């Protein structure tokens, strides 16, 4: 709908710079804890074939070892220009799917870093007034840009 | 032929009207302990009268496939009252204890509003 306000991509960098430590503090409490492991290890075991035949998707397939992530197999937008890894489980239980999600938080920081650097300039909505509305400056000075504004919102 | 149509459970009315009776037996032998678990304030008498009314309204049907659905839906409405998935309010929504009468005589409808 609008372009990013000036001074936003800097704040995202400040947040992304310190987030990775917060994940580490999360893992200290849970990953190697014996109490947390006993409530997630060998719990909810799902076989690879059952996951596919029950319609499971996401970490419910990867957690069981199936290598599949739509961002890399059927890419949309510009997910074909960012490098990241897809965490994969080996056991297929609650603990493994908890490690995929915690790992997916680290690969998101990895992707967010690249998006900040590789952001290109230009417009932010399709330059076609019959699908996306025109700017308010133009809607108030051109008769074509007012008709299309009138009919896109009514 | 277009008239030929796949059946649901029963291939003709004689076979279809058997299920209506078997379904009716289930309801008649379920009100007394329905009124007990749900702690309703209606006697088993008028509880059983209600089931009589519901069947009697679907008495003009003559299509075996329409009757099968009215039984299939009837069985579902029973599984909810035996497994107590329905709450006290759901079972008492048949008896309409909060809707004022809507008279059928012409003058009463004429006095109140424009509807027929």
């Amino acid at each position: 709908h609008q372009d990013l306000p000036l001074g936003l991509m800097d704040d995202i960098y400040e947040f992304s710079k310190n987030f990775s430590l917060r994940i580490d503090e999360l893992e200290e409490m849970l990953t190697n804890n014996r109490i947390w492991r006993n409530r997630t290890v060998d719990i909810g075991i799902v076989t690879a074939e059952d996951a596919l035949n029950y319609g499971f998707s996401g970490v419910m397939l990867r957690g069981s070892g199936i290598q599949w992530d739509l961002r890399k197999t059927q890419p949309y937008d510009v997910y074909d220009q960012v490098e990241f890894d897809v965490p994969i489980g080996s056991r297929g239980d609650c603990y493994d799917r908890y490690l995929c999600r915690v790992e997916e938080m680290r690969q998101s920081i990895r992707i967010i870093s690249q998006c900040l650097n590789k952001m290109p300039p230009g417009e932010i909505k399709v330059d076609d007034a019959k699908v996306s509305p025109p700017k308010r400056a133009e809607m108030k000075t051109s008769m074509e840009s007012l008709i299309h504004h009138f009919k896109l919102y009514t | 032929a277009s008239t030929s149509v796949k059946p649901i459970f029963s291939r003709d009315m004689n076979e279809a009207k058997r299920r209506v009776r078997e379904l009716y037996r289930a309801w008649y032998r379920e009100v007394p302990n329905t009124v007990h678990l749900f702690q309703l304030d209606i006697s088993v008498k008028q509880g059983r009268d209600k089931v009589r009314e519901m069947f009697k309204k679907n008495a003009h049907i003559t299509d075996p496939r329409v009757v099968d659905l009215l039984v299939i839906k009837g069985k579902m409405e029973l599984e909810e009252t035996i497994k107590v998935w329905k709450q006290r309010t759901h079972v008492m929504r048949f008896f309409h204890e909060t809707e004022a009468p809507r008279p059928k005589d012409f003058l009463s409808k004429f006095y109140v509003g424009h509807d027929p």
Binding site: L6, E14, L21, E123 | -
Partner: protein, 56 residues
């Protein structure tokens, strides 16, 4: 960031890491709340010629 040195050492020792360089509270590294007005670009259809709609 106002923690005395002894507390800084104790928090750092307990956690096993240097927490002072990655504070979760923001002090002055945030961008200013008022910014110079922008002037955004215009799309590739802002041409006065060779821009008939039927070709796009």
């Amino acid at each position: 960031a106002s923690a005395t040195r002894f507390i800084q050492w104790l928090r750092n020792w307990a956690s096993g890491r240097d927490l002072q360089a990655k504070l979760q509270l923001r002090y002055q590294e945030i961008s200013k709340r008022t910014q110079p007005p922008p002037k955004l670009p215009v799309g590739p259809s802002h041409k006065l010629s060779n821009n008939y709609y039927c070709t796009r």
